[PDB]
Paper text:
The Alc. vinosum [name]–RC complexes used for cryo-EM analysis were purified using two different methods: (i) one-step extraction using n-dodecyl β-D-maltopyranoside (DDM) followed by sucrose density gradient centrifugation (hereafter designated as sucrose-density), and (ii) two-step solubilization by lauryldimethylamine N-oxide (LDAO) and n-octyl β-D-glucopyranoside (OG) followed by DEAE chromatography using DDM and CaCl2. The cryo-EM structures of the Alc. vinosum [name]–RC complexes were determined at 2.24 Å resolution for both sucrose-density and Ca-DEAE purified samples. The two structures are virtually identical in both protein conformation and cofactor arrangement with a root-mean-square deviation (RMSD) of 0.37 Å for the mainchain Cα carbons but they differ in the number of divalent cations bound to the RC Cyt-subunit. Hereafter, we describe only the structure of the [name]–RC complex purified by the sucrose-density method because it was purified under physiological conditions that retained all natively bound Ca ions. A total of six Ca ions are located on the periplasmic side of the Alc. vinosum [name] complex and are divided into two groups: four on one side of the [name] ring and two on the opposite side. All Ca2+ are positioned close to the [name] BChl a molecules, and each Ca2+ is ligated by the mainchain oxygens of Trp44 and Val49, the sidechain of Asp47 in α1-polypeptides, and the mainchain oxygen of β3-Trp46 (or β1-Trp45). Because of the high resolution of our structure, two water molecules were identified as additional Ca2+ ligands; this leads to a hexa-coordinated octahedral structure, in which each Ca2+ resides at the center of a plane formed by α1-Asp47, β3-Trp46 (or β1-Trp45) and oxygens of the two waters with the mainchain oxygen atoms of α1-Trp44 and α1-Val49 as axial ligands. In addition, several water molecules were identified near the Ca2+-binding sites forming a hydrogen-bonding network with nearby residues and the Ca2+-ligating waters that stabilizes the Ca2+-binding sites.
The photosynthetic apparatus of Alc. vinosum consists of two light-harvesting (LH) complexes, [name] and LH2, and the reaction center (RC) complex. The Alc. vinosum [name] is a closed ring structure composed of 16 pairs of αβ-polypeptides, 32 bacteriochlorophylls (BChl) a, and 16 all-trans spirilloxanthins that are uniformly distributed around the RC. The Alc. vinosum RC contains a tetraheme-cytochrome (Cyt) subunit and four BChls a, two bacteriopheophytins a, one 15-cis-spirilloxanthin, a menaquinone (MQ)-8 at the QA site and a ubiquinone (UQ)-8 at the QB site. The cryo-EM structure of the Alc. vinosum [name]–RC complex identified three forms of α-polypeptides (six α1, nine α2, and one α3) and two forms of β-polypeptides (ten β1 and six β3).
Numbering used by the authors:
A (entry chain Y): 3 to 54, 58 to 64
B (entry chain W): 2 to 51
C (entry chain H): 1 to 259
D (entry chain Q): 5 to 47
E (entry chain M): 2 to 319
F (entry chain 3): 4 to 66
G (entry chain C): 23 to 333
H (entry chain L): 2 to 278
The structure:
Amino acid sequence: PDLWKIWLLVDPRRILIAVFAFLTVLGLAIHMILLSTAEFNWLEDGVPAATVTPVVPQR
Amino acid sequence: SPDLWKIWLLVDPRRILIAVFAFLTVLGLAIHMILLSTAEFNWLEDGVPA
Amino acid sequence: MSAAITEYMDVAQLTIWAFWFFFAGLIIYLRREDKREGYPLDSDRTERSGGRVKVVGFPDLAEPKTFVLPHNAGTVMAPRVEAPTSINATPVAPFPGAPFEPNGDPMLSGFGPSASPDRAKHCDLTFEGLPKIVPLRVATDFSIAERDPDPRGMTVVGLDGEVAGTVSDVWVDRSEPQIRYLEVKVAAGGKNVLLPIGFSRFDKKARKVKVAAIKAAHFANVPTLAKPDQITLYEEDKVCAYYAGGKLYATAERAGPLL
Amino acid sequence: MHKIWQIFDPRRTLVALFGFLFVLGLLIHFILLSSPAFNWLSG
Amino acid sequence: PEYQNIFTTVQVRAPAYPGVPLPKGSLPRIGKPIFSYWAGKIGDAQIGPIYLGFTGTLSIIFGFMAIFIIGFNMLASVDWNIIQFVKHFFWLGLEPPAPQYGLTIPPLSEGGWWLMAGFFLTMSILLWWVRTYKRAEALGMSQHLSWAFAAAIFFYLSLGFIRPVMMGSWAEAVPFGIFPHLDWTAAFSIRYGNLYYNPFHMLSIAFLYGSALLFAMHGATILAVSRFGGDREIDQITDRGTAAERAAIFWRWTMGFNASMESIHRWAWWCAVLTVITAGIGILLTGTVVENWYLWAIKHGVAPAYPEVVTAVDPYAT
Amino acid sequence: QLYKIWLAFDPRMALIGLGAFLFALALFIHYMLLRSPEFDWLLGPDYAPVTLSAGMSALPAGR
Amino acid sequence: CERPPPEVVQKGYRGVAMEQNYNPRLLEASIKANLPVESLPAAAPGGPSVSDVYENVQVLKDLSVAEFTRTMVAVTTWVAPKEGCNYCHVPGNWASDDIYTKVVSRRMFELVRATNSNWKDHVAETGVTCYTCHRGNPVPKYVWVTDPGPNQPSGVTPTGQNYASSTVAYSALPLDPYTPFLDQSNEIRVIGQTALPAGNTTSLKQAEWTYGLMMQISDSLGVNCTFCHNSRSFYDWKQSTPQRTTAWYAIRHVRDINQNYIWPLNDALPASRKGPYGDPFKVGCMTCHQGAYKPLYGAQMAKDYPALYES
Amino acid sequence: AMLSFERKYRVRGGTLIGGDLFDFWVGPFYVGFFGVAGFFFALLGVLLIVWGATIGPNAELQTYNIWQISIAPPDLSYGLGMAPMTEGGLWQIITICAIGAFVSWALREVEICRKLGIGFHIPFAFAFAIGAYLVLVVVRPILMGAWGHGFPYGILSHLDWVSNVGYQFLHFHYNPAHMLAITFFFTNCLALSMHGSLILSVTNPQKGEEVKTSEHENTFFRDIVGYSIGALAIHRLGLFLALSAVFWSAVCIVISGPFWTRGWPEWWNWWLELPLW
Ligand code: BCL
Ligand code: BCL
Ligand SMILES: CC[C@H]1c2cc3[nH]c4c(c3C)C(=O)[C@H](C(=O)OC)c4c3nc(cc4[nH]c(cc(n2)[C@@H]1C)c(C(C)=O)c4C)[C@@H](C)[C@@H]3CCC(=O)OC/C=C(\C)CCC[C@H](C)CCC[C@H](C)CCCC(C)C
Ligand SMILES: CC[C@H]1c2cc3[nH]c4c(c3C)C(=O)[C@H](C(=O)OC)c4c3nc(cc4[nH]c(cc(n2)[C@@H]1C)c(C(C)=O)c4C)[C@@H](C)[C@@H]3CCC(=O)OC/C=C(\C)CCC[C@H](C)CCC[C@H](C)CCCC(C)C
Ligand SMILES: CC(C)=CCC/C(C)=C/CC/C(C)=C/CC/C(C)=C/CC/C(C)=C/CC/C(C)=C\CC/C(C)=C/CC/C(C)=C/CC1=C(C)C(=O)c2ccccc2C1=O
Ligand SMILES: COC(C)(C)C/C=C/C(C)=C/C=C/C(C)=C/C=C/C(C)=C/C=C\C=C(C)\C=C\C=C(C)\C=C\C=C(C)\C=C\CC(C)(C)OC
Ligand code: HEM
Ligand code: HEM
Ligand SMILES: CCCCCCCCCCCCO[C@@H]1O[C@H](CO)[C@@H](O[C@H]2O[C@H](CO)[C@@H](O)[C@H](O)[C@H]2O)[C@H](O)[C@H]1O
Ligand SMILES: [Ca+2]
Ligand SMILES: [Ca+2]
Ligand SMILES: [Fe+3]
Ligand SMILES: [Mg+2]
């Protein structure tokens, strides 16, 4: 009800810079974490029934 | 929102334009890199067409 | 040729021994260089011998080297004979190695942390021959950076929190641009005194300069400058040493011990 | 041309150009020596 | 707390100093000097001008050629894939010629590029040494820096040129790469029986450790007496102030002896210089007069013996 | 009359000093329980160690 | 980032720092991933013999029919549990050799019997079982082929190194140590055994190749170099551990497996079981060990199957 | 005996503990309370090392060879308890004496700083070296769970400890904090040679020249690298580089085994497995 008083303490340009930068980094980090898993890597999980040389088993 | 234009009194469009353009370019580069590193979505190494 | 000098001696063993001989000579050289100042030593050994035994240790002293000063300021010899200087203190006990207690007011004694040598009564000079440490009112091309607060006008506060004065001017180094002294208008007397930047802790929010070395009352006794717009090397030492004496003398508890 | 010495110092230009030419000359000789087909110091 | 003189609280701005005038006929300094606020927080604000003379130009041209060759070969090693170049950059390298080539020039990708990069980098370093010598000479200064640089160059030349020539093999030399030259460093110690037992490696470490010890000692000492102007060491050398006296007295009371304001810089100079001098000697002795440093240590009674709590049957003794 | 601590210790330093000490002590004790396998709650409530059979040994022979 | 303390195994003198460090939770996961298969109940004594009943039995001739059937049930679980007996057999015909998997598996029986009977300097009464490599997979998970390294421009000779590879535990060392040392018999020793030079012309580069092999050995066993060495003298057998002696025989054992059992099977094997160079999927360390100091952490399965020992 | 300018500085007071009890000098040394404590901490530790060398690992291997003398920590089986004197207990006692001596040395430096009215940078800097030693013999052994993880007290034997600890991670060069610490060590040595050279070349110029100025000093490195840090700041930098080297060296060893048990090159797999490549 009286929460608008917070920007009387903090410059509301820098906070806008901070929240965008923090949200972007957080958004990228969560995406990287999901991509690093086998369960939630949406590009290499086979579904939607992927269509794509001798192999090197050790490497 | 109908009153969103009042942001620009706090952020100079010079800094906004550079930051937006630099971030988008890196984002587009990063996403292309991510796709190229996958076998399924590497359009250059997938062998299609022919 | 080969790696084996004898059945046991080999080239690497010779090389490491060769280094030890060079290194021994290097340490002897470095120690001799170390002894260009403060030697022969002030010793009881010399005192009872009537000066007949000069205490130099090993290695002995090197032949005097020559420092030719710029702008015809003179020539100094690094190993030089220095006249004995009396100390405004007396031993706290009669055994050797005992410390001395300053005589009179310790802040004014010129002893201990408040002691200083008598440097030359000439100003340090820039490469162009101008005095190096000068107020901002004569170094007109110098300025405070925009992002930093101007020291001028700030309230100078002693170690006790009591107000000592205000910052009238800032003394800058004209060779390497930086603050070296803060000219303080003393609240009690009004006579301007210098305050080294090393004893000044800035409080940017409060616009206060906090001096933990000395109290507000101690500012009245800071050594003064002969000329108002320049400071000699001798005066620089006198001013800095006075504030340093406060780190030990200003308050009784500063003498210690803690417990 | 003739004005290229009006906006370029002759001294800085010449030492730089000779430096590049000397480095380039060394590089080509090195490449030829690396090539077995053009090493003139072989049999 | 008291001002620790770690960061400049209030910075002073003056017109940019062009620098001490150079002798007549010298090239002018290039670059319009600028002031960096954050550089001035820890040090001097002024950036530039720089002297880029004839020698510096040649050093830059030679240096870029060597660096370009290294980076090109790193890119070629990942088959031109710039994405894989970034991923593997620390692991990539320009690798020295194979052992079978001896000291001969091999084909480009078999060590030929490495030799060119080695030669061009060496030339640029040598030209940079001449530049440091000339800059001191142009200011009427002594050549302490160029001597110390020559000592570092001696070690650098020992690693990549002098030792490989003495062993008659470019394959002994250092790869041009971040992890590859760390692999070389480990393999060098492993190949020649534990470089820990190389006494000049021991000395080099003592001087490297001493360099950190001395600069920590001297850096802390000057900052501790900077309230008396101890930073102005020329003043304290020509006109000994209370800063030099208190600095010397502190160390005399601490460890029984002390240096002077000038001689501490001689201790500093020699400690750093001896780090690369003994490093070069230790490298030059390894593989030429000593094959196994641990076995050399055993012969000279340096390696300690441990009680045999674990041992292996030697399969070659069958 | 227990105010006297605040006449000899600044409220601000003690409160920050107390918070740093209490947070460090809590982190330390939480870590000590994690150090002990009996109180390692990060292993899960229904944590069962792997059963070893047929001459298995988790660790190689020691000394 | 791991949480201390690790489980530490001291192997040398105090203060020499010859220790194995194990993260207890990482060790727990590895043990759960390397659990043995429970042995089948022992076959009924006596009964008809293999030779009397079966025609095309060339290796397991000395078996009883009950023991022979027990072995086939065992190898089915060990090699092809998801494919059954028909993986290695023509349907309807047990004695037919008209499928490559039967020709290979017959040779694999000889590989196992030779290992359990003649390589005890390495496998030491624990022995091996088809499960030790296959772990219920027709293709063992951890095999190797001759590695060309990363693709190179056609005019560039590969260095074989300076490329982040898990084969050398993510260092820049030569990434294919299997081919020179575990298939061929290139000399691993590089260190001179005299204080002064006495003719050891081994290059520094060869030390990197040995370092690469030891990186693979240590990763394969989940141990560090001090498991077998006092690093102050890598060459010295007197300051080494008994496991270094076992590893020495294991290298020769692996060479024998690859040269005398896997390589002659190359023609029977399909193209999918071959590398770019055309060499077959080969056995190295980590094919049995799979990151553990002993395969299945020393689980003893072979002793319950008489078919896995030479007559 | 004092320096010819030293007598006016030998003031009473400034002690942390002891007051006038030990406030005196013995020759050049200031003693104070922590001079007495530190000296007899060092004296006992040194004598115990000599005694440790007198009995050796055993009577057969016992040696007075200065390279081969080694006082070894306990076996790891003793955990974090006390070991018998001849089985690592002597090492534990010497370690305690070493900590007592090192800390007393730092505290004696504090009292000297108070006497002279100078900054406390030197004892603060020395605390970093002490902290590195404490990490090696206390913090890391406790995190690992045994005093036997400390390095042995021997001129060459502690190199064998360093070697084997390094090879416990198969390639120690890949330790990231280790790489950072070496960079600081190498840069510090370079900075020290540069600072030593510049001061010497300015105060000992070519023959026939006067002593140079601070303007020459700034100009010289501006002429070479385009930037001069300044006469004051080079000492900030030298202190920063040396302290950062030791801080990161302490980090590198305390993460090697307590917070990382794998080979160090494998740690970089986080970068290799980034989905960008
Ligand atoms: C197939 C391999 C052949 C070979 C084929 C070629 C070919 C093709 C060329 C050379 C050229 C050169 N070769 Mg050849 N060369 C071989 C073997 C050698 C060997 C040797 C020991 O084996 C040496 C030392 C040389 C050396 C040389 C140089 C003389 C010359 C490169 C100079 C340069 O780079 O200027 C660059 C550096 C500078 C500083 C240039 C500026 C010169 C000065 C400063 C300006 C003076 C101006 C003056 C008035 C005008 C005359 C110019 C003169 C060069 C001085 N060659 C082998 C056998 N060589 C090149 C040449 O002829 O250039 C003249 C050339 O095109
Ligand atoms: C092992 C069994 C249980 C368990 C057993 C216990 C027991 C027993 C206790 C806790 C307690 C706590 N547990 Mg628990 N806890 C477990 C698992 C967890 C997990 C987890 C995800 O696993 C978390 C996040 C926690 C978290 C917590 C905290 C809520 C609490 C510690 C209080 C504290 O740190 O105050 C210290 C920090 C402060 C900031 C205190 C503030 C007071 C001061 C005066 C404020 C000064 C402010 C000033 C500005 C200074 C600021 C700090 C400085 C600037 C640095 N527990 C396991 C599962 N836990 C303790 C508790 O309940 O405390 C209330 C407690 O006794
Ligand atoms: C006492 C021993 C220590 C030491 C000493 C030492 N090093 C030194 C010196 C000394 C005394 C110098 O005088 C010299 C120096 O200049 O220092 C500032 C130097 C130096 N030590 C350096 C590095 C260095 N020192 C090291 C080590 C050490 N140096 C030892 C620990 C190390 C380590 C630990 O590996 C390194 C990496 C350099 C910073 C410098 C020598 C610079 C040099 O030789 O430069 C050659 C130039 C090139 C190879 C590159 C040129 C090509 C460019 C990259 C092209 C592209 C950009 C271009 C410049 C743009 C502008 C172009 C213009 C035309 C406009
Ligand atoms: C943190 C940055 C660097 C640094 C800084 C530093 N060192 C310092 C200081 C500072 C600021 C001091 O003020 C203090 C000093 O006064 O120096 C002259 C000191 C000092 N650094 C010293 C040594 C030293 N510093 C080292 C390192 C470093 N010092 C860092 C690289 C090393 C290395 C790398 O090995 C050594 C050997 C001393 C010369 C001195 C401290 C003297 C001291 O504490 O004296 C009291 C103790 C004794 C006289 C003897 C104690 C003996 C013990 C009781 C028994 C032995 C125990 C020991 C563990 C044996 C181990 C032996 C084997 C390892 C061979
Ligand atoms: C009652 C009774 C008898 C008691 C016993 C006596 C007691 C208690 C004595 C107290 C002191 C004690 C405990 C002594 C016992 C232990 C002993 C003998 C210690 C000796 C001191 C000691 C550890 C010496 C080691 C010195 C060594 C080997 C290395 C130090 C590093 C080194 C190479 C320094 C050389 C360079 C120097 C001198 C640097 C100091 C120095 C620096 C760093 C400056 O920047 C500076 C700037 C301007 C002027 C001067 C200086 C200066 O002198
Ligand atoms: C701007 O640059 C671009 C982008 C264009 C390209 C940049 C690429 C990059 C990023 C390259 C990065 C390279 C890196 C990171 C290199 C790292 C190198 C390291 C760490 C090297 C470390 C040590 C190397 C040493 C010590 C090598 C010494 C070699 C010597 C001394 C060799 C001398 C050889 C000679 C003199 C050859 C003599 C033979 C003669 C006869 C010439 O041969 C014909
Ligand atoms: C007696 C038990 C074993 C049986 C029955 C067996 C069976 C087989 C079969 C049928 C194949 C071919 C599979 C295919 O290509 O689809 C095969 C291949 C292979 N086996 Fe075994 N094997 C046994 C033991 C072992 C052991 C102990 C090792 C390890 C030393 C091993 C390593 C391999 C390898 C490397 C291959 C090649 C990869 C492949 O073609 O699948 N096997 N085995
Ligand atoms: C990554 C850590 C390791 C390093 C740095 C390392 C280093 C070396 C080196 C340099 C050699 C050559 C010795 C010589 O020249 O005389 C070697 C040989 C050997 N290493 Fe390792 N090693 C490591 C790990 C291991 C492990 C864990 C084992 C045991 C499983 C092992 C067993 C052996 C054996 C048996 C030899 C002798 C091989 C032969 O002579 O054919 N090593 N090692
Ligand atoms: C050491 C550097 C300075 C740190 C100061 C603290 C030093 C160590 C603190 C003292 C702790 C002593 O704690 C005591 O240790 C011994 C030795 O492990 C333990 O002894 C126990 O383990 C040892 C070996 O692990 C067994 O031989 C013994 O059978 C068993 O009782 C005691 O059960 C324990 O009571
Ligand atoms: Ca998908
Ligand atoms: Ca495509
Ligand atoms: Fe200095
Ligand atoms: Mg390599």
